[PDB]
Design a protein around this ligand. Structure first.
Ligand SMILES: *C(=O)CCCCCCCCCCCCC
Length: 131
């Protein structure tokens, strides 16, 4: 509308600090911040979510289970949005690889913690014999 893209200069310095490839030297550019935001609108997702780190958390979650269904276009997004969330959490990644994994690995740890409380609910009755 009247203004596109949030991340200001002071913040951009961090966005342009993230690499694109694992063993490459390419970095991120505004072009990507927009190329992604312009996708959310079509992905039934509000572009005002990328403004906050929390907003992205909800986005990646939706595209997560779609990483398989969606086409190559859905893959390029996850790799991008992943770099953003890290920038907002004051987290510095090494590239589009360490970034995506840094988020994918975090979901694996939460999965166990989410299905661990069930134990406290279940009946805990131990028993041991002796001579
Ligand atoms: C006019 O109303 C267009 C509104 C454009 C949406 C703002 C872009 C979202 C902020 C930047 C996205 C960050 C992705 C790395």
């Amino acid at each position: 509308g009247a203004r596109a893209s949030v991340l200001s200069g002071g913040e951009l310095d961090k966005w342009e600090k993230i690499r694109l490839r694992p063993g490459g030297k390419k970095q991120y550019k505004l072009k990507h911040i927009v190329w992604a935001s312009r996708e959310l609108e079509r992905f039934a997702v509000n572009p005002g979510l990328l403004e906050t780190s929390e907003g992205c958390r909800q986005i990646l979650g939706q595209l997560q289970p779609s990483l398989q269904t969606g086409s190559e276009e859905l893959r390029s997004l996850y790799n991008t949005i992943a770099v953003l969330y890290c920038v907002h959490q004051r987290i510095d990644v090494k590239d589009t690889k360490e970034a995506l994994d840094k988020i994918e690995e975090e979901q694996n740890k939460s999965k166990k913690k989410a299905q661990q409380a069930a134990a406290d609910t279940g009946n805990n009755s131990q028993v041991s014999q002796n001579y």
